[PDB]
PDB file of C-alpha atoms and ligand atoms in Angstrom:
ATOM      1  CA  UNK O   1     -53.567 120.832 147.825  1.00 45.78           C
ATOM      2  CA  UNK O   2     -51.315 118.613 145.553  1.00 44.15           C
ATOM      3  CA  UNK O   3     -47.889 120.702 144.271  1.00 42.88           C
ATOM      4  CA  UNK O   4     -44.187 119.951 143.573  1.00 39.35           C
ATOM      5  CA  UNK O   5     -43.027 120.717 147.959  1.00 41.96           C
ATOM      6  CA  UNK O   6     -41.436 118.344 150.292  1.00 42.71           C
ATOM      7  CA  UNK O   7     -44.863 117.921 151.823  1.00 40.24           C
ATOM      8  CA  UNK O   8     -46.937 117.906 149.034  1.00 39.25           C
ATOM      9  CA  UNK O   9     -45.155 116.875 145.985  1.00 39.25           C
ATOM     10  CA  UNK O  10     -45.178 113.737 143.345  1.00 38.14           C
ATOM     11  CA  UNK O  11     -44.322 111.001 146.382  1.00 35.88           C
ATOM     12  CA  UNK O  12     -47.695 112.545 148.214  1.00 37.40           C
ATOM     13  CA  UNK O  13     -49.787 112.278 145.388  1.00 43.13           C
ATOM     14  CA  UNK O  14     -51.282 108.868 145.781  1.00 46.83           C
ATOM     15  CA  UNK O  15     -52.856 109.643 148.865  1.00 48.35           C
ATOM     16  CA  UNK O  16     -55.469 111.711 146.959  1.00 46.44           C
ATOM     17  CA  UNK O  17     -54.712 109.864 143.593  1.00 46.15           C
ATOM     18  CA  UNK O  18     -53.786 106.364 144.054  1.00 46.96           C
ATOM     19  CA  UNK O  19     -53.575 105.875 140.216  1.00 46.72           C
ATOM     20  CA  UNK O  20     -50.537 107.224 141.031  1.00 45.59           C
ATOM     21  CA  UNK O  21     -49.412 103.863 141.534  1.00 42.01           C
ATOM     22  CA  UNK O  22     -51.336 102.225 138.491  1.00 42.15           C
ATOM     23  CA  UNK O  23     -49.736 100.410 135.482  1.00 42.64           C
ATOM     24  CA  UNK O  24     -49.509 102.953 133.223  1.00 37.32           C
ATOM     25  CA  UNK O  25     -48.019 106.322 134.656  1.00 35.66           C
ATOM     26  CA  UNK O  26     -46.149 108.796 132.861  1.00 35.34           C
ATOM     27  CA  UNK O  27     -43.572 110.423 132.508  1.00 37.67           C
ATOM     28  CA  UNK O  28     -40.692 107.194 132.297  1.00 36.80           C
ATOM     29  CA  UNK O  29     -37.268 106.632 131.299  1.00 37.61           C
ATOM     30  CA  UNK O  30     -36.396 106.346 127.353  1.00 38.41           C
ATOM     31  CA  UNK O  31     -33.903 103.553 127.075  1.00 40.50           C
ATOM     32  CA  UNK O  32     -33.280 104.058 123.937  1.00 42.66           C
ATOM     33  CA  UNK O  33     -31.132 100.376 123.272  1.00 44.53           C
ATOM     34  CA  UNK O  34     -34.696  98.757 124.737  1.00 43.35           C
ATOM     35  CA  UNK O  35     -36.925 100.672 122.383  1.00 44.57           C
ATOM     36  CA  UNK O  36     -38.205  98.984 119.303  1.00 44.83           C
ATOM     37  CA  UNK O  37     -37.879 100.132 115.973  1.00 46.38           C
ATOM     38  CA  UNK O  38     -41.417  99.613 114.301  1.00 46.66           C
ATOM     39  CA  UNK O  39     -41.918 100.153 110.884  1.00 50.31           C
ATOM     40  CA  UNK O  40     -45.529 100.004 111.080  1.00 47.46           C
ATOM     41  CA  UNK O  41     -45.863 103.400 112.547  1.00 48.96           C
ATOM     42  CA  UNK O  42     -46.170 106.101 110.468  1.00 50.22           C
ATOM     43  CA  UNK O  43     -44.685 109.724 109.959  1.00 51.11           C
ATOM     44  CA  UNK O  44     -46.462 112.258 112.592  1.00 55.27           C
ATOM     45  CA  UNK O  45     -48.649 114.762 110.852  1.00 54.35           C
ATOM     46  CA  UNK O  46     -48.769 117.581 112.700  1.00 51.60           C
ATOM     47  CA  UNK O  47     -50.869 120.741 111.139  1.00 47.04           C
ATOM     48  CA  UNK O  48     -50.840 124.157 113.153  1.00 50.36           C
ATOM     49  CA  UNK O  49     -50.842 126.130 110.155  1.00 49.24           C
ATOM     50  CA  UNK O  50     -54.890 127.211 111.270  1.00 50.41           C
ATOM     51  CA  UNK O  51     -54.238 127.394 115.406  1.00 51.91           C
ATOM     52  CA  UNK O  52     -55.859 130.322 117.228  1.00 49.46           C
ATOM     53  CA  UNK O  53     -54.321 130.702 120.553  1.00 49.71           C
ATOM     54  CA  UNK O  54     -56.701 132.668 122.925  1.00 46.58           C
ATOM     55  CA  UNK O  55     -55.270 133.438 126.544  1.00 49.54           C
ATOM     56  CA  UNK O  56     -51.596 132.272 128.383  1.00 47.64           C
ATOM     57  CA  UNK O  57     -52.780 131.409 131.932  1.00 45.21           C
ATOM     58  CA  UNK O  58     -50.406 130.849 135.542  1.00 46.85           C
ATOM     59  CA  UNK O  59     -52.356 128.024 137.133  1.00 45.34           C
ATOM     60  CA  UNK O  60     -50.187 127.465 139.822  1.00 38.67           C
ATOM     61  CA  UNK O  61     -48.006 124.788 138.581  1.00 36.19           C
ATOM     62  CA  UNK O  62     -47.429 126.385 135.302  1.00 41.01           C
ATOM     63  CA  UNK O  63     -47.926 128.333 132.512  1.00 40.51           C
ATOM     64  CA  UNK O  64     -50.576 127.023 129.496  1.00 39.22           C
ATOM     65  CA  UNK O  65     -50.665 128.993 126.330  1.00 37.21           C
ATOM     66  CA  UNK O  66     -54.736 128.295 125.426  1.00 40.04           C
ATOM     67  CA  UNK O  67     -56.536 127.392 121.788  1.00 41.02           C
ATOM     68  CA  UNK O  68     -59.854 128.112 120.223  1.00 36.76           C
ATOM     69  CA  UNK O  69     -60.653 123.824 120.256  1.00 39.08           C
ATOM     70  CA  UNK O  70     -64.531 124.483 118.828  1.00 37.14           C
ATOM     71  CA  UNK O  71     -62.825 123.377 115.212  1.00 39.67           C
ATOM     72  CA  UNK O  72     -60.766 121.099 113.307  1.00 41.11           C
ATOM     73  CA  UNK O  73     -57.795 123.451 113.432  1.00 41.09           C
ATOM     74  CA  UNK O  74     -54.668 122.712 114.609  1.00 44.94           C
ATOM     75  CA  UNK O  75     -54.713 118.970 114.967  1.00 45.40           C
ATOM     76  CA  UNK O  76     -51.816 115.842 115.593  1.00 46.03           C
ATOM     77  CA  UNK O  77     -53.214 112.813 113.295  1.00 43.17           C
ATOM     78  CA  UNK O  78     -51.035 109.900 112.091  1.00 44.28           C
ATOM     79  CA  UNK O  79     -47.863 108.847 113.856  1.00 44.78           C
ATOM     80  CA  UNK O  80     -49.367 106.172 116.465  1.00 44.79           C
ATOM     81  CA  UNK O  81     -52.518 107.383 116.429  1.00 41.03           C
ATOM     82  CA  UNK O  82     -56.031 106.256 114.797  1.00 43.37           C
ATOM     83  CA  UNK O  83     -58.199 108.946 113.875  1.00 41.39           C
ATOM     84  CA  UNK O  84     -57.828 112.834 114.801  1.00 39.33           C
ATOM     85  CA  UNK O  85     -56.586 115.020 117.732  1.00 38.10           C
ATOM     86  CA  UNK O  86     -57.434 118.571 118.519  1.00 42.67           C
ATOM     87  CA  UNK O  87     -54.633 120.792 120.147  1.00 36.84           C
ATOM     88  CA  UNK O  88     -55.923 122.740 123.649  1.00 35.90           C
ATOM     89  CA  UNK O  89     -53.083 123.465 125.119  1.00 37.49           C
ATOM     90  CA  UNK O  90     -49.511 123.510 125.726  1.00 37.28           C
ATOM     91  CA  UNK O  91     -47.114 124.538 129.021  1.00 40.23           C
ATOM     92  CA  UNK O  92     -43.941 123.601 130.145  1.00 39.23           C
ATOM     93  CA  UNK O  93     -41.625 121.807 133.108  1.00 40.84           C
ATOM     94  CA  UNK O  94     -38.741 122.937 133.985  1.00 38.88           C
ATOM     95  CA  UNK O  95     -36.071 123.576 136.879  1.00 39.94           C
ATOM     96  CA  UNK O  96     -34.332 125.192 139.159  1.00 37.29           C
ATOM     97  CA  UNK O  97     -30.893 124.598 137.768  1.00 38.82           C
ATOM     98  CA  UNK O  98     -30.438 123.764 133.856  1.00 37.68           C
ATOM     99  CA  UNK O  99     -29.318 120.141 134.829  1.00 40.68           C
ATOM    100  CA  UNK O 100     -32.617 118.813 135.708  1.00 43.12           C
ATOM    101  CA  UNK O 101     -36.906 119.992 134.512  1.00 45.10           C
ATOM    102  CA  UNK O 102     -37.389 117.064 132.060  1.00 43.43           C
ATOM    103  CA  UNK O 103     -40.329 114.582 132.849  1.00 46.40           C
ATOM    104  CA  UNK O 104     -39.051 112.035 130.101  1.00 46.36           C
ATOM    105  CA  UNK O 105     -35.438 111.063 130.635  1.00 48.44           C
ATOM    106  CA  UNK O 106     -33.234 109.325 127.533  1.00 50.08           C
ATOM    107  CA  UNK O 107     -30.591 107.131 128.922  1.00 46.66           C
ATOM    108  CA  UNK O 108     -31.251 108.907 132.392  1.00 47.75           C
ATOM    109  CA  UNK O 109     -30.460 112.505 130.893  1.00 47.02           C
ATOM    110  CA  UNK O 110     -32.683 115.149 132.185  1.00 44.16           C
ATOM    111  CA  UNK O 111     -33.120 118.249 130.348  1.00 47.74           C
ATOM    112  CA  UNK O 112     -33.220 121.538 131.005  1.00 48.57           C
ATOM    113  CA  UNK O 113     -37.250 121.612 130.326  1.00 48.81           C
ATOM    114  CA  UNK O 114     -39.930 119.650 128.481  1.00 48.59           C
ATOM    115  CA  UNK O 115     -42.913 121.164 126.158  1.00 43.88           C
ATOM    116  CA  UNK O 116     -46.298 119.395 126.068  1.00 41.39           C
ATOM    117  CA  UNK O 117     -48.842 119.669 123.918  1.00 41.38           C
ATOM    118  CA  UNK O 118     -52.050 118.368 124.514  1.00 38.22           C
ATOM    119  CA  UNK O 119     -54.543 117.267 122.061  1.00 44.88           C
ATOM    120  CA  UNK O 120     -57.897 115.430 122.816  1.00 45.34           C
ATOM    121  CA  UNK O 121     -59.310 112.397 120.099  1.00 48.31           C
ATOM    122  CA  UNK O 122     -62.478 114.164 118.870  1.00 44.32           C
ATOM    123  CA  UNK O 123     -63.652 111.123 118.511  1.00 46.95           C
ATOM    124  CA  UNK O 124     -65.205 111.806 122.664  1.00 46.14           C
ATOM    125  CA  UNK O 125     -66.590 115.220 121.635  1.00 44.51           C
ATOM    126  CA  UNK O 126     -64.918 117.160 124.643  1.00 44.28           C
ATOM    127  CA  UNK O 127     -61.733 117.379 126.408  1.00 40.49           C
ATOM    128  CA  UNK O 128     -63.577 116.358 129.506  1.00 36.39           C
ATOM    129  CA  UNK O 129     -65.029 113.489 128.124  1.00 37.33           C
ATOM    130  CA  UNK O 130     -61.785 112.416 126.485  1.00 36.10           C
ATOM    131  CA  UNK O 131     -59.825 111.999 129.571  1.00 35.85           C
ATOM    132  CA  UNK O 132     -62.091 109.353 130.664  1.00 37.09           C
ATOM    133  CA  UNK O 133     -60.456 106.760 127.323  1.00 35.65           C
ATOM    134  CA  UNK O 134     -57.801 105.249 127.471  1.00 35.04           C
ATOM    135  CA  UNK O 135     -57.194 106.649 123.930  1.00 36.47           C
ATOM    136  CA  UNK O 136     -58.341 109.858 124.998  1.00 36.80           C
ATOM    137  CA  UNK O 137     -55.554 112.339 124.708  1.00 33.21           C
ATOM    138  CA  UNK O 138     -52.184 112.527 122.760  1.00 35.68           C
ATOM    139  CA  UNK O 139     -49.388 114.924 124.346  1.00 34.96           C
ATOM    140  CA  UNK O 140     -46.538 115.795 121.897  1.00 33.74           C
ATOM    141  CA  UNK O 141     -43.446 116.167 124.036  1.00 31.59           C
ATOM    142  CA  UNK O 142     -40.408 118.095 123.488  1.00 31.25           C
ATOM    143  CA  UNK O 143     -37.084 118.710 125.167  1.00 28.23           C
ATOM    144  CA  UNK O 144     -35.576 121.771 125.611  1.00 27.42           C
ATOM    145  CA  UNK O 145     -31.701 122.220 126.266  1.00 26.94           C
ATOM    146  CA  UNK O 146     -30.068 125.665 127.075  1.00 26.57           C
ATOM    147  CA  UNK O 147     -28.250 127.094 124.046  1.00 29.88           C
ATOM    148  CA  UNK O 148     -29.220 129.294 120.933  1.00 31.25           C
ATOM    149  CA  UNK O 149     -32.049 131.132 121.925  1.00 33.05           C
ATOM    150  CA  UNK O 150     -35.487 130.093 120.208  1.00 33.42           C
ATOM    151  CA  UNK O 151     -37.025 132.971 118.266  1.00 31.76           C
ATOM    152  CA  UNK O 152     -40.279 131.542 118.001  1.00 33.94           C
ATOM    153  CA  UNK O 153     -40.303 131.060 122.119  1.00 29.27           C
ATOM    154  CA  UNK O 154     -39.911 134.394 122.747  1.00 26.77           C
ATOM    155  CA  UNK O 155     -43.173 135.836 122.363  1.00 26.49           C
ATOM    156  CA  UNK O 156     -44.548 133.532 125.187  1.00 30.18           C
ATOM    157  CA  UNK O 157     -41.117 134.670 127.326  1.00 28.03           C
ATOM    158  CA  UNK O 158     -42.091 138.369 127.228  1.00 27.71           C
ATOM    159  CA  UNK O 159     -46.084 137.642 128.251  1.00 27.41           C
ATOM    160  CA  UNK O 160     -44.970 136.500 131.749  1.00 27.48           C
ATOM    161  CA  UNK O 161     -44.167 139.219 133.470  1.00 24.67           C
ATOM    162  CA  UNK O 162     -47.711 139.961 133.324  1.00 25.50           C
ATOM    163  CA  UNK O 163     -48.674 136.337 134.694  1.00 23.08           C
ATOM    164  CA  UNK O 164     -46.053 136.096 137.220  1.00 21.59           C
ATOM    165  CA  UNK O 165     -49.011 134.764 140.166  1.00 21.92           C
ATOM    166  CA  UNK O 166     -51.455 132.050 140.172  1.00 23.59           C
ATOM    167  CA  UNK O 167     -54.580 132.705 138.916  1.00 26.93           C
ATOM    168  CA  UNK O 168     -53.136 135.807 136.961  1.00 27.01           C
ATOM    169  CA  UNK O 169     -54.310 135.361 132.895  1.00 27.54           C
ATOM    170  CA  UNK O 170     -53.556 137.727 129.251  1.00 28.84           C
ATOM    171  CA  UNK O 171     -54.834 137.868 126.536  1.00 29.16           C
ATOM    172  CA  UNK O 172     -52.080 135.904 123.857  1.00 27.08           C
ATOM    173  CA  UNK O 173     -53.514 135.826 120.505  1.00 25.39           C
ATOM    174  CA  UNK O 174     -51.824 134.785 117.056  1.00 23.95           C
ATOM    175  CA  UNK O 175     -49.197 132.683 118.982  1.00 25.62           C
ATOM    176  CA  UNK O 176     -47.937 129.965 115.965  1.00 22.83           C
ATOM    177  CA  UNK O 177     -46.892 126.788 117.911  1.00 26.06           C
ATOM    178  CA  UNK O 178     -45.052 125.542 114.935  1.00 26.76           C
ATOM    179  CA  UNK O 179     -42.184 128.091 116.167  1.00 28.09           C
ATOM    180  CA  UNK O 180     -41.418 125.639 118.853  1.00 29.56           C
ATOM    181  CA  UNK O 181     -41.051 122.562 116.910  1.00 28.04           C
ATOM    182  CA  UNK O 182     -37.649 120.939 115.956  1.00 28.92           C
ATOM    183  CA  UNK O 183     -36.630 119.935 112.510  1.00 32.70           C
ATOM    184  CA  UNK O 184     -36.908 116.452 112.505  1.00 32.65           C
ATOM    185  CA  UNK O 185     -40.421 114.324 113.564  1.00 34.54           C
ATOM    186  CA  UNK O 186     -38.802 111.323 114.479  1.00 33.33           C
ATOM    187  CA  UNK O 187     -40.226 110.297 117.905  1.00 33.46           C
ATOM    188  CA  UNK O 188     -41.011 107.865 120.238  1.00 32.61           C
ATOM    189  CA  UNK O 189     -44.250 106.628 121.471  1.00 32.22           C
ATOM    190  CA  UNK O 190     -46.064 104.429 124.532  1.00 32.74           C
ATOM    191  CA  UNK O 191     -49.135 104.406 126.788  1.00 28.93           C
ATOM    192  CA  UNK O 192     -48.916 106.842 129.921  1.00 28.23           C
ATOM    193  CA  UNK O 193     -51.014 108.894 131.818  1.00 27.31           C
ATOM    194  CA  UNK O 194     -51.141 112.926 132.614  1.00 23.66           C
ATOM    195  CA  UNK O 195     -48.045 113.845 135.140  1.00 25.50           C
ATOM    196  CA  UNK O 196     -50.000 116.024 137.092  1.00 27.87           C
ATOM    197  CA  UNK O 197     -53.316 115.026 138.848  1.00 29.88           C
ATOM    198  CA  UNK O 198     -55.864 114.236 138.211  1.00 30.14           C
ATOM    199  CA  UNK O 199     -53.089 111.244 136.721  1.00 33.21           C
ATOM    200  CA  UNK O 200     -55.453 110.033 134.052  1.00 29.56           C
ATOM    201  CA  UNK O 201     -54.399 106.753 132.390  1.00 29.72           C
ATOM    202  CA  UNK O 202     -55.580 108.351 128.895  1.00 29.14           C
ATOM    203  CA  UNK O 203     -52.529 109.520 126.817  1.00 28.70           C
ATOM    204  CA  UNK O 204     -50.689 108.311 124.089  1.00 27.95           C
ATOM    205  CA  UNK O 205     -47.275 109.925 124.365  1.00 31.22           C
ATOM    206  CA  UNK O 206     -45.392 110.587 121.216  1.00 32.44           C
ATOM    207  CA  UNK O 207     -41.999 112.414 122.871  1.00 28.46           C
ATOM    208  CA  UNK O 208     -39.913 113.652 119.850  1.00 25.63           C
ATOM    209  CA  UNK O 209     -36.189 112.785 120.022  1.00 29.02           C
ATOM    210  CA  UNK O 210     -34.481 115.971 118.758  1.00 28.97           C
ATOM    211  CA  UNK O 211     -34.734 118.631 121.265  1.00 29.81           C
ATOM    212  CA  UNK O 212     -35.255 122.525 120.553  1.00 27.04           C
ATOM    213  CA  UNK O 213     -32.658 124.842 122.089  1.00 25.26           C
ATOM    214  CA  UNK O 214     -33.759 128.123 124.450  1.00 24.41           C
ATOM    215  CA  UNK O 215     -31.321 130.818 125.729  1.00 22.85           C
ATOM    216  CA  UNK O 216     -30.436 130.423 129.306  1.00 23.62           C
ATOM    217  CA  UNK O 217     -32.064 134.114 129.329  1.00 24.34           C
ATOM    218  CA  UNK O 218     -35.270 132.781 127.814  1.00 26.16           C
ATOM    219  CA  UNK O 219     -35.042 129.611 130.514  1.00 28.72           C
ATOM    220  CA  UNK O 220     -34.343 132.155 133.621  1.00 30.82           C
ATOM    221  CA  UNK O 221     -37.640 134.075 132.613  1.00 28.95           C
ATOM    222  CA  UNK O 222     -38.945 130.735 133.281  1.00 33.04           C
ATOM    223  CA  UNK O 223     -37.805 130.650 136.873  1.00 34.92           C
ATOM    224  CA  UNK O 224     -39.310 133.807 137.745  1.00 36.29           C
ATOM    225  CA  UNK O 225     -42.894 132.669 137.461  1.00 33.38           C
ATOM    226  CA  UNK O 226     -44.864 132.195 141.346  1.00 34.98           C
ATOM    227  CA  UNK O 227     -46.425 129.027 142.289  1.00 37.96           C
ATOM    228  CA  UNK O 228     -48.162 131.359 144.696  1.00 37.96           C
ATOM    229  CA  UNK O 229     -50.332 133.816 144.265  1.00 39.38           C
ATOM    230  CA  UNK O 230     -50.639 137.796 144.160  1.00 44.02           C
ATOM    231  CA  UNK O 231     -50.223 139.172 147.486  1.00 38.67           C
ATOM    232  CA  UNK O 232     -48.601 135.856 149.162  1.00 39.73           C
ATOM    233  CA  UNK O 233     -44.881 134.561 150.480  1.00 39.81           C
ATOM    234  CA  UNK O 234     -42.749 134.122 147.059  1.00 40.90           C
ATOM    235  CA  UNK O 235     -42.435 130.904 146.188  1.00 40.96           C
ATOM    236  CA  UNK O 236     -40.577 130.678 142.431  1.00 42.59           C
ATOM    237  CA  UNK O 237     -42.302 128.372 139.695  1.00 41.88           C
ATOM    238  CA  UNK O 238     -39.096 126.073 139.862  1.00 40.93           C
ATOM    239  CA  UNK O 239     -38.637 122.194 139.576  1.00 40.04           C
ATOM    240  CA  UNK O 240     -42.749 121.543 138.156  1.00 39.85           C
ATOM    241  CA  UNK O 241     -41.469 117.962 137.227  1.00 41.38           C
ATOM    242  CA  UNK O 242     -42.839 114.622 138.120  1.00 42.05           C
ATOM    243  CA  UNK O 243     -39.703 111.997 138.327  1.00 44.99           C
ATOM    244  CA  UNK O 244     -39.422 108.919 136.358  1.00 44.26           C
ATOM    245  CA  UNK O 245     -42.439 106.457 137.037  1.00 43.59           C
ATOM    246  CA  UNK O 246     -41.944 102.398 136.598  1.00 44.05           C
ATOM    247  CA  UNK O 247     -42.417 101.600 133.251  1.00 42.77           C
ATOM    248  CA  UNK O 248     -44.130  98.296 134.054  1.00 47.20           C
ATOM    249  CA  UNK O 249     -46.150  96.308 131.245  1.00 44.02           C
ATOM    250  CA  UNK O 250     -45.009  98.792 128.644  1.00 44.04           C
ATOM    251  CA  UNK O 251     -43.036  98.936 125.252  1.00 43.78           C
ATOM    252  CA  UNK O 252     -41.321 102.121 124.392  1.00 43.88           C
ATOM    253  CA  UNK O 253     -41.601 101.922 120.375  1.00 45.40           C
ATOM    254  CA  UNK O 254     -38.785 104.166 118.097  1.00 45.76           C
ATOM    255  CA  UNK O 255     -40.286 105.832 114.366  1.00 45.65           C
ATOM    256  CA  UNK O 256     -36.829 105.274 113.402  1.00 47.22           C
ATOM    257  CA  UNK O 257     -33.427 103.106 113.185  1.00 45.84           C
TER     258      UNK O 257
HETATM  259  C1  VQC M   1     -54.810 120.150 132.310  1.00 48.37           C
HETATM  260  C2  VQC M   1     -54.702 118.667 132.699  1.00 48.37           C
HETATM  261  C3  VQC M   1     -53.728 118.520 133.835  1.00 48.37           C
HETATM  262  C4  VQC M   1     -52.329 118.846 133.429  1.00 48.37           C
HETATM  263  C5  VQC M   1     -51.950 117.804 132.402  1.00 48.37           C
HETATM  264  O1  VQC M   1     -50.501 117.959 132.134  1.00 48.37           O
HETATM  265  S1  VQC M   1     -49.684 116.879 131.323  1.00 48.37           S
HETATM  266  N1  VQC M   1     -48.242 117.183 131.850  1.00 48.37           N
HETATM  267  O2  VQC M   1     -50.150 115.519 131.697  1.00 48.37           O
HETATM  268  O3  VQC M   1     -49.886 117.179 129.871  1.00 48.37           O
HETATM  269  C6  VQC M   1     -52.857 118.039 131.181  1.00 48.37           C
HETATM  270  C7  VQC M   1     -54.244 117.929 131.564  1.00 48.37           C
HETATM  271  C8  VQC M   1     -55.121 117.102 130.845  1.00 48.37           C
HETATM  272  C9  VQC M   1     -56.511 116.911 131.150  1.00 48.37           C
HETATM  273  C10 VQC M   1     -57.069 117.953 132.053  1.00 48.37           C
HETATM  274  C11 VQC M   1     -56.077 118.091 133.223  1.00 48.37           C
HETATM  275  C12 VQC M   1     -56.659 118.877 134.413  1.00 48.37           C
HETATM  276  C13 VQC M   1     -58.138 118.551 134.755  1.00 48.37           C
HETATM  277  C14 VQC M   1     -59.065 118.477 133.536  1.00 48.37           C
HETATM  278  C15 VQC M   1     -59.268 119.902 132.969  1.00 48.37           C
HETATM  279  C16 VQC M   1     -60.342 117.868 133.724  1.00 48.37           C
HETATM  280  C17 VQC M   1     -60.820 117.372 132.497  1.00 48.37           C
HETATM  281  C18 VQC M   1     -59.602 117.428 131.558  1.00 48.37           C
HETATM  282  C19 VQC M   1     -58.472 117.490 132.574  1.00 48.37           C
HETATM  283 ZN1   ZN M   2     -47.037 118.439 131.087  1.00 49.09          ZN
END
């Protein structure tokens, strides 16, 4: 099966996904000089104040911290986007050293770790169904460097010692995503696709540029997840990032000068 290995990480993943190779794959390098300043697009409106988190959940690639999606709750609307999108989910990427666990890149920098949050158009009914439009999804990324530690990160930080296999799942209830967000909004947005298979072809990015800090504590805790699972040779949850993808056909547009 598909995972981040010499053998069957991102350069094997065509084989059983040859959108892997498609016009519009994600993640890609920011140049920030190249990206255009467009004051048609609009402030992000991002409102978490009603989110119900369910269930945290080690997959085998990474962690996702779960949402009750059966109402309009905590939903991403304006920036790029037409209409309304519900938040599922969110998880992480990160590495093995603090140097490199970005997907994005600015100017080539990697950092230390990337949040996504995933939220489907409701405008396709399901999450399922979304994936299939090319309008289907918008993922709010964010970049994490290693510095002051983030108080609102470090209820997810202390669930994962109960997670630390795949498969493994807790119960993670009144989690308030809008602990994780920096102060400013201003982002950048283009068309990409999921960085993990299935490689869909369906998200609007919207990658904000101020990144939050973590501690390198709350980072390490990280790095002691498993990619494998209970009862199996210990492989640490290290280096879940797909590399920079050719940016093709694509403008990267800036919400600000
Ligand atoms: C969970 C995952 C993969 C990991 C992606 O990560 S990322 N880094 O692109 O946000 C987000 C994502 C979006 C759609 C989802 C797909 C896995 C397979 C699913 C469940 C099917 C229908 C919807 C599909
Ligand atoms: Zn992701």
């Amino acid at each position: 099966h598909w995972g981040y290995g010499k053998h069957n990480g991102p350069e094997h993943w065509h084989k059983d996904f040859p959108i892997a190779k498609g016009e519009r794959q994600s993640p890609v390098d920011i140049d920030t000089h190249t990206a255009k300043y467009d004051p048609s697009l609009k402030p992000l409106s991002v409102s978490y104040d009603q989110a119900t988190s369910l269930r945290i959940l080690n997959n085998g690639h990474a962690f996702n911290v779960e949402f009750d999606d059966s109402q309009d709750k905590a939903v991403l609307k304006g920036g790029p986007l037409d209409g309304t999108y519900r938040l599922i989910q969110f998880h992480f990427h990160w590495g093995s050293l603090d140097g490199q666990g970005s997907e994005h890149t600015v100017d080539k920098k990697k950092y230390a770790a990337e949040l996504h949050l995933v939220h489907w158009n409701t405008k396709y009914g399901d999450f399922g169904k979304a994936v299939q439009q090319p309008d289907g999804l918008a993922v709010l990324g964010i970049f994490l460097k290693v510095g002051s530690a983030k108080p609102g990160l470090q209820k997810v930080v202390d669930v994962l010692d109960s997670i630390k296999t795949k498969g493994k799942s807790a119960d993670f209830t009144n989690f308030d995503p809008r602990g994780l967000l920096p102060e400013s909004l201003d982002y950048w947005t283009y068309p990409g696709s999921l960085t993990t298979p299935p490689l869909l072809e369906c998200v609007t990015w919207i990658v904000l540029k101020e990144p939050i800090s973590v501690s390198s504590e709350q980072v390490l805790k990280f790095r002691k997840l498993n990619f494998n699972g209970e009862g199996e040779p210990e492989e640490l949850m290290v280096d879940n990032w797909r590399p920079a993808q050719p940016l093709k056909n694509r403008q990267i547009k800036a919400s600000f000068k």
